[PDB]
Design a protein around this ligand. Structure first.
Ligand code: MG
Ligand code: MG
Ligand code: MG
Ligand code: MG
Ligand code: MG
Ligand code: MG
Ligand code: MG
Ligand code: MG
Ligand code: MG
Ligand code: MG
Ligand code: MG
Ligand code: MG
Ligand code: MG
Ligand code: MG
Ligand code: MG
Ligand code: MG
Ligand code: MG
Ligand code: MG
Ligand code: MG
Ligand code: MG
Ligand code: MG
Ligand code: MG
Ligand code: MG
Ligand code: MG
Ligand code: MG
Ligand code: MG
Ligand code: MG
Ligand code: MG
Ligand code: MG
Ligand code: MG
Ligand code: MG
Ligand code: MG
Ligand code: MG
Ligand code: MG
Ligand code: MG
Ligand code: MG
Ligand code: MG
Ligand code: MG
Ligand code: MG
Ligand code: MG
Ligand code: MG
Ligand code: MG
Ligand code: MG
Ligand code: MG
Ligand code: MG
Ligand code: MG
Ligand code: MG
Ligand code: MG
Ligand code: MG
Ligand code: MG
Ligand code: MG
Ligand code: MG
Ligand code: MG
Ligand code: MG
Ligand code: MG
Ligand code: MG
Ligand code: MG
Ligand code: MG
Ligand code: MG
Ligand code: MG
Ligand code: MG
Ligand code: MG
Ligand code: MG
Ligand code: MG
Ligand code: MG
Ligand code: MG
Ligand code: MG
Ligand code: MG
Ligand code: MG
Ligand code: MG
Ligand code: MG
Ligand code: MG
Ligand code: MG
Ligand code: MG
Ligand code: MG
Ligand code: MG
Ligand code: MG
Ligand code: MG
Ligand code: MG
Ligand code: MG
Ligand code: MG
Ligand code: MG
Ligand code: MG
Ligand code: MG
Ligand code: MG
Ligand code: MG
Ligand code: MG
Ligand code: MG
Ligand code: MG
Ligand code: MG
Ligand code: MG
Ligand code: MG
Ligand code: MG
Ligand code: MG
Ligand code: MG
Ligand code: MG
Ligand code: MG
Ligand code: MG
Ligand code: MG
Ligand code: MG
Ligand code: MG
Ligand code: MG
Ligand code: MG
Ligand code: MG
Ligand code: MG
Ligand code: MG
Ligand code: MG
Ligand code: MG
Ligand code: MG
Ligand code: MG
Ligand code: MG
Ligand code: MG
Ligand code: MG
Ligand code: MG
Ligand code: MG
Ligand code: MG
Ligand code: MG
Ligand code: MG
Ligand code: MG
Ligand code: MG
Ligand code: MG
Ligand code: MG
Ligand code: MG
Ligand code: MG
Ligand code: MG
Ligand code: MG
Ligand code: MG
Ligand code: MG
Ligand code: MG
Ligand code: MG
Ligand code: MG
Ligand code: MG
Ligand code: MG
Ligand code: MG
Ligand code: MG
Ligand code: MG
Ligand code: MG
Ligand code: MG
Ligand code: MG
Ligand code: MG
Ligand code: MG
Ligand code: MG
Ligand code: MG
Ligand code: MG
Ligand code: MG
Ligand code: MG
Ligand code: MG
Ligand code: MG
Ligand code: MG
Ligand code: MG
Ligand code: MG
Ligand code: MG
Ligand code: MG
Ligand code: MG
Ligand code: MG
Ligand code: MG
Ligand code: MG
Ligand code: MG
Ligand code: MG
Ligand code: MG
Ligand code: MG
Ligand code: MG
Ligand code: MG
Ligand code: MG
Ligand code: MG
Ligand code: MG
Ligand code: MG
Ligand code: MG
Ligand code: MG
Ligand code: MG
Ligand code: MG
Ligand code: MG
Ligand code: MG
Ligand code: MG
Ligand code: MG
Ligand code: MG
Ligand code: MG
Ligand code: MG
Length: 362
RNA sequence: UAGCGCCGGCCAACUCCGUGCCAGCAGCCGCGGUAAUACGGAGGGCGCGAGCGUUACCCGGAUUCACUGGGCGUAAAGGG
RNA sequence: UGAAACUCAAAGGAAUUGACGGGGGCCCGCACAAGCGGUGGAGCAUGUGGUUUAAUUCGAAGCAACGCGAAGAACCUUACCAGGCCUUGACAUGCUAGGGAACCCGGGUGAAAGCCUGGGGUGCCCCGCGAGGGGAGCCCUAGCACAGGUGCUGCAUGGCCGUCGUCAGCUCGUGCCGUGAGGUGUUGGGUUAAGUCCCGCAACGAGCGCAACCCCCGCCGUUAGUUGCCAGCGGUUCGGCCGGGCACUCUAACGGGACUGCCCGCGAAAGCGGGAGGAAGGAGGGGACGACGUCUGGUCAGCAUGGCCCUUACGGCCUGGGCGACACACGUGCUACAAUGCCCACUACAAAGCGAUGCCACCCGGCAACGGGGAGCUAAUCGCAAAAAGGUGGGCCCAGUUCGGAUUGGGGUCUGCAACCCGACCCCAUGAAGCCGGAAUCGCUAGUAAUCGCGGAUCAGCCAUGCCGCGGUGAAUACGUU
RNA sequence: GAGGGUAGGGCCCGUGACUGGGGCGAAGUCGUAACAAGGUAGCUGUACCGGAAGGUGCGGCUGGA
RNA sequence: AAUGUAAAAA
RNA sequence: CGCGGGGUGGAGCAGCCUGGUAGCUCGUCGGGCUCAUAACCCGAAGGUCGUCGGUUCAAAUCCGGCCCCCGCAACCA
RNA sequence: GUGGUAAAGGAUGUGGCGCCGCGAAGACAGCCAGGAGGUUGGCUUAGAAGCAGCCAUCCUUUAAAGAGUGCGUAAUAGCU
């Protein structure tokens, strides 16, 4: 375990120098009264000042755990060496605190997620893999200790799955699956090829939380404006001196509907409203899906030029391309061994990527 | 003062590491999907040298508009 | 009449070899047809998929993976899992250093490994009378070189094997033919199990295949007389027991013997049909034997090996667990559903094979398994052995039955440190589904199928119904090649 | 008489909601027309017709028997 | 009595 | 606001008039043919009958109300 | 200018009855002084000092001063 220890120390270490200097600029800032007489200003001041709580304790606590262990650890099979080992068992649940502080920082990491597998380049073979990944991610959820609700499944032509979708019930289901989007490369002799040669195939994967609605809130009076007016066409003297035309304009969007079918202003206002609803509902509905089209913008590559992590069963080895990391047990990987992988590699990269972007050019 | 192009085949010049359908090469054929004389670096080699390569266009090869010097049953081509 | 942008490294002719055809011709193989029995239904056994698990080690995948590696998984085995412990090692060679010889015996400890640790002890070499020490082996401990890996790649590979297929084919030298790939030969008529042989021929000949040479089985002769024999006489506790003999049986070496050889017909021949003689005929029956090559077949977990990766651990030890999990799916199997039968008594006829801390004769005790005594046997001398189905006598009388024996309870023996998980057997009781099985599908052409036992490898014992081999009783049916 | 102005034509280029087809694209949906009597010989002018390849009628050709 | 994509030839 | 028709396994339809038993097709699941998938063959599972209430011994079936789908209708000024 | 014709709801309009408590041992008002100590009550919150939100009931100096009325600062002090 000496390996993952120095690793967690390395994570906390680069935090040190950066937040080291970042703290010193901020602290002498919080000294002046002129700084505080700017209320909203010294708010975000005390915010960064706050971040120095999670910064300090990690470095301090972890720094001392490295050294102390190193000493009474090197050599002994019985006495004081096994005395020092379970002192780091509590330090192992303190490694726990560290990891939780690196993952939980997603928009909706904490809530359950929704995974979807959709095959790609590779034909009948490509979809055979889609199902392999289905069981893969499914099987992982069982071990993570999570309930899997399969929302939709659709077997393909020969091999079985043109598409599939799942609901990983639990907590941090999203934060955990989050770094599993993108395509996946799969090399092997094709169980469908009459010659059996090596064939690359590609499946797609995506992931998402869950949310609410907004409909009726809009029909609130003060937002729209209703005009009356004489109708048009037939009515005789009735249509003349009887205004039964109605037009509800939805001021917030300008969108409007007008109606003058019946002879009743009340029955016409009733109708217009009932149609403005449906129109206004579709607009707001699109806007919802239009936000998910900007979540397609978060990542939405093609289908086989691009990859994320290769799985070759020939030479036995998976390879997350995002991290350079490797392995040689695609069998185990295609079963659930993801914690270690996702944890470090995926979280690290994902978080450090967007994080360093945000604090350097975003 | 000594530099530049190249060393899979055409085409004169071969090994090692790295890499792993990625990074890249490319004039044609093609080369890279963990073991590459074809990517990239190194050692060495071939070519030229105050140059060496590239791009662009002209004539050559192209007897591929054929006068020199071609064809037309089925290859492109005999007119109903 | 007739463009262009754009785009491709081809498009394309004729001919060649091969594969394919719901093209053809000739021909074959339990391929179909004829025919007998059987899986698919049920119970159980066994392998596999899946799911489950702390782990349920891994490989094998249509034919050619699935009672297959495994010809023996309680711990061993064991590659997996949990926990305890060593971390130049359980094994190799080497260099070096300090302490002890070697070796044997123990105690505290712990689940065992392992760790703490007392005793006995003082051999062999050099110097000296001794002392004292130094040198070899051997061990403790230190260190380095290095071990070790059933970690990965059978798409790096040797070896071995499966396979098409015991199919009759594959090909070479020279000549000739074609610009050439290539063709001929090898094709064509006849013939056969066959590129078997004849005949013909721009080829002539040769090689790997086929056959033949090797093993088993059939008839017979030679040599051999601790098996068998009154065949033949004599004695008999009348048993081939003693004498006696090897003839016959048999045991095992060696040889004879069949070659379309003979007769008859057809035929150019090869060969074919029919007849004798013959134990046996047209290859007498069974084996061993599997061409060039095919499948990126199989296997780096038999072993070997290029590369890779691990290195107080991806190596090593122990204890326990697991491989034997079960809502399920299939493959090979065993026992059956009963009267061409089940039971019980009693009686007969084999083969091949194995066996001296193995085979165990007989006695005793026990319902029994099994235990106690105990003779013989390194074995054509004694032993596993009762072969079983058969034969004759008795019982049941059509029923879920005296059919069928699953499941469960209870009591017990034996192996092995140990039978919870997990052995095998015995006895009592309990007595399940099953009344011949959907669509579908396997085997076999004669001493065959069906059927009935016996043995052996493995191995303490055994989850063997599995495998390899042995003999006993012994059919049906092939008009025909669509 | 330069040139300007007026009106009317011709050629050429750019641009346009939409619309026709075409080329290309490791994977999609539909079916299987062609290549072996490709399992209705194919191919062709033309005419009708049909999601799609196609089908069918008339004639014609063997690049069919 | 229909169909089987997409990485194999010093 | 009216009048008429209807909500039945996953899909689409039947059954209700004239109360006792929920059927048909595709699809689904198991097995088979195939080298494999489709087709084809063998076997099986699946329905609170919109919801609330009533009449009855008994309600998909009869009666009343609410909810959703469809068809008509909304004229003279 | 009610009268000369409006409602919830509001307000130190004015008159009348009634009950309660305070005051010549000095009330109500105004006005001078303190107005405190652990405390900065505990809990959350970036912060939460009687004084955002949540939970709540100490004693001491005294003749007197609330774990606190309202403002106010980022949070104080502050004034009350
Ligand atoms: Mg510390
Ligand atoms: Mg210290
Ligand atoms: Mg311990
Ligand atoms: Mg401790
Ligand atoms: Mg971490
Ligand atoms: Mg749900
Ligand atoms: Mg479909
Ligand atoms: Mg499927
Ligand atoms: Mg295929
Ligand atoms: Mg195959
Ligand atoms: Mg409002
Ligand atoms: Mg009008
Ligand atoms: Mg009108
Ligand atoms: Mg009118
Ligand atoms: Mg009016
Ligand atoms: Mg009016
Ligand atoms: Mg109108
Ligand atoms: Mg109207
Ligand atoms: Mg908006
Ligand atoms: Mg693409
Ligand atoms: Mg696993
Ligand atoms: Mg050059
Ligand atoms: Mg040159
Ligand atoms: Mg060269
Ligand atoms: Mg890279
Ligand atoms: Mg690499
Ligand atoms: Mg290399
Ligand atoms: Mg390569
Ligand atoms: Mg080059
Ligand atoms: Mg290079
Ligand atoms: Mg150089
Ligand atoms: Mg010069
Ligand atoms: Mg030119
Ligand atoms: Mg030119
Ligand atoms: Mg020219
Ligand atoms: Mg020409
Ligand atoms: Mg001419
Ligand atoms: Mg042209
Ligand atoms: Mg003319
Ligand atoms: Mg003319
Ligand atoms: Mg013409
Ligand atoms: Mg003309
Ligand atoms: Mg032209
Ligand atoms: Mg052109
Ligand atoms: Mg144009
Ligand atoms: Mg073939
Ligand atoms: Mg057969
Ligand atoms: Mg046979
Ligand atoms: Mg038959
Ligand atoms: Mg059966
Ligand atoms: Mg069965
Ligand atoms: Mg199976
Ligand atoms: Mg479970
Ligand atoms: Mg393996
Ligand atoms: Mg396995
Ligand atoms: Mg076995
Ligand atoms: Mg362990
Ligand atoms: Mg050693
Ligand atoms: Mg040395
Ligand atoms: Mg001891
Ligand atoms: Mg003692
Ligand atoms: Mg000595
Ligand atoms: Mg000596
Ligand atoms: Mg000496
Ligand atoms: Mg001496
Ligand atoms: Mg001496
Ligand atoms: Mg001496
Ligand atoms: Mg002496
Ligand atoms: Mg002496
Ligand atoms: Mg010596
Ligand atoms: Mg020596
Ligand atoms: Mg292989
Ligand atoms: Mg091999
Ligand atoms: Mg062959
Ligand atoms: Mg041939
Ligand atoms: Mg030939
Ligand atoms: Mg002829
Ligand atoms: Mg021959
Ligand atoms: Mg004899
Ligand atoms: Mg006698
Ligand atoms: Mg006598
Ligand atoms: Mg006589
Ligand atoms: Mg005798
Ligand atoms: Mg002879
Ligand atoms: Mg003859
Ligand atoms: Mg005869
Ligand atoms: Mg023979
Ligand atoms: Mg034979
Ligand atoms: Mg032979
Ligand atoms: Mg191979
Ligand atoms: Mg394999
Ligand atoms: Mg291996
Ligand atoms: Mg190896
Ligand atoms: Mg090796
Ligand atoms: Mg390691
Ligand atoms: Mg390490
Ligand atoms: Mg004995
Ligand atoms: Mg005995
Ligand atoms: Mg007895
Ligand atoms: Mg016994
Ligand atoms: Mg005994
Ligand atoms: Mg004897
Ligand atoms: Mg035995
Ligand atoms: Mg009997
Ligand atoms: Mg009888
Ligand atoms: Mg019964
Ligand atoms: Mg007893
Ligand atoms: Mg029954
Ligand atoms: Mg019966
Ligand atoms: Mg046996
Ligand atoms: Mg045994
Ligand atoms: Mg047996
Ligand atoms: Mg003019
Ligand atoms: Mg003019
Ligand atoms: Mg002008
Ligand atoms: Mg004018
Ligand atoms: Mg003009
Ligand atoms: Mg225009
Ligand atoms: Mg266009
Ligand atoms: Mg067109
Ligand atoms: Mg088009
Ligand atoms: Mg277009
Ligand atoms: Mg086209
Ligand atoms: Mg496409
Ligand atoms: Mg699709
Ligand atoms: Mg298409
Ligand atoms: Mg298609
Ligand atoms: Mg077709
Ligand atoms: Mg057709
Ligand atoms: Mg044709
Ligand atoms: Mg036509
Ligand atoms: Mg249509
Ligand atoms: Mg015609
Ligand atoms: Mg004509
Ligand atoms: Mg033709
Ligand atoms: Mg014909
Ligand atoms: Mg299709
Ligand atoms: Mg396709
Ligand atoms: Mg294809
Ligand atoms: Mg209906
Ligand atoms: Mg209704
Ligand atoms: Mg309805
Ligand atoms: Mg109904
Ligand atoms: Mg429905
Ligand atoms: Mg429904
Ligand atoms: Mg439903
Ligand atoms: Mg109704
Ligand atoms: Mg059905
Ligand atoms: Mg099915
Ligand atoms: Mg099926
Ligand atoms: Mg296949
Ligand atoms: Mg399959
Ligand atoms: Mg099927
Ligand atoms: Mg379809
Ligand atoms: Mg059934
Ligand atoms: Mg059915
Ligand atoms: Mg059905
Ligand atoms: Mg049914
Ligand atoms: Mg039913
Ligand atoms: Mg109803
Ligand atoms: Mg009912
Ligand atoms: Mg209307
Ligand atoms: Mg009127
Ligand atoms: Mg009227
Ligand atoms: Mg007034
Ligand atoms: Mg009032
Ligand atoms: Mg009031
Ligand atoms: Mg008042
Ligand atoms: Mg007073
Ligand atoms: Mg205060
Ligand atoms: Mg405080
Ligand atoms: Mg506080
Ligand atoms: Mg204060
Ligand atoms: Mg405050
Ligand atoms: Mg109190
Ligand atoms: Mg201030
Ligand atoms: Mg503050
Ligand atoms: Mg204060």
């Amino acid at each position: 375990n000496a390996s993952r220890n120095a690793w967690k120390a390395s994570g906390g270490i680069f935090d040190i120098p950066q937040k080291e200097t970042r703290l010193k600029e901020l602290e002498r800032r919080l000294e002046d009264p002129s700084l505080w007489n700017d209320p909203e200003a010294a708010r975000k001041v005390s915010q960064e000042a706050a971040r120095l709580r999670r910064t300090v304790d990690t470095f301090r606590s972890l720094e001392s755990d490295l050294q102390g262990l190193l000493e009474l650890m090197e050599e002994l099979p019985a006495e004081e060496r096994e005395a020092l080992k379970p002192e780091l068992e509590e330090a192992a649940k303190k490694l726990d605190e560290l990891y939780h502080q690196t993952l939980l920082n997603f928009p909706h990491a904490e809530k359950n997620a929704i995974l979807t597998i959709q095959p790609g380049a590779g034909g009948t073979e490509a979809c055979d893999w889609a199902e392999m990944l289905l069981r893969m991610y499914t099987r992982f959820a069982e071990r993570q200790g999570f309930q899997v609700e399969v929302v939709d499944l659709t077997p393909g032509p020969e091999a079985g799955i043109d598409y599939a979708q799942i609901l990983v019930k639990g907590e941090n289901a999203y934060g955990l699956l989050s770094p599993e989007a993108g395509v996946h490369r799969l090399v092997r002799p094709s169980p469908f090829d009459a010659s059996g040669r090596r064939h690359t195939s590609f499946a797609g994967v995506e992931v998402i939380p869950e949310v609410d609605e907004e409909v009726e809130v809009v029909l609130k009076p003060e937002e729209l404006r209703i005009d009356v007016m004489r109708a048009s066409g037939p009515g005789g003297q009735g249509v003349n001196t009887t205004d039964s035309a109605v037009r509800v304009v939805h001021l917030p969007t300008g969108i409007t509907v007008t109606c003058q079918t019946t002879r009743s202003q009340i029955k016409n206002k009733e109708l217009a409203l009932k149609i403005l609803k449906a129109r206004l509902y579709e607009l707001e509905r699109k806007k919802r899906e239009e936000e998910l089209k900007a979540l397609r913008g978060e990542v939405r590559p093609i289908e086989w030029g691009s990859q994320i992590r290769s799985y070759v069963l020939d030479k036995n080895y998976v390879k997350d391309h995002r991290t350079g990391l490797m392995r040689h047990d695609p069998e185990n990987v295609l079963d659930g061994d993801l914690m270690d992988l996702i944890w470090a590699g995926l979280e690290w990269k994902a978080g450090r990527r967007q994080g360093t972007e945000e604090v350097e050019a975003e």
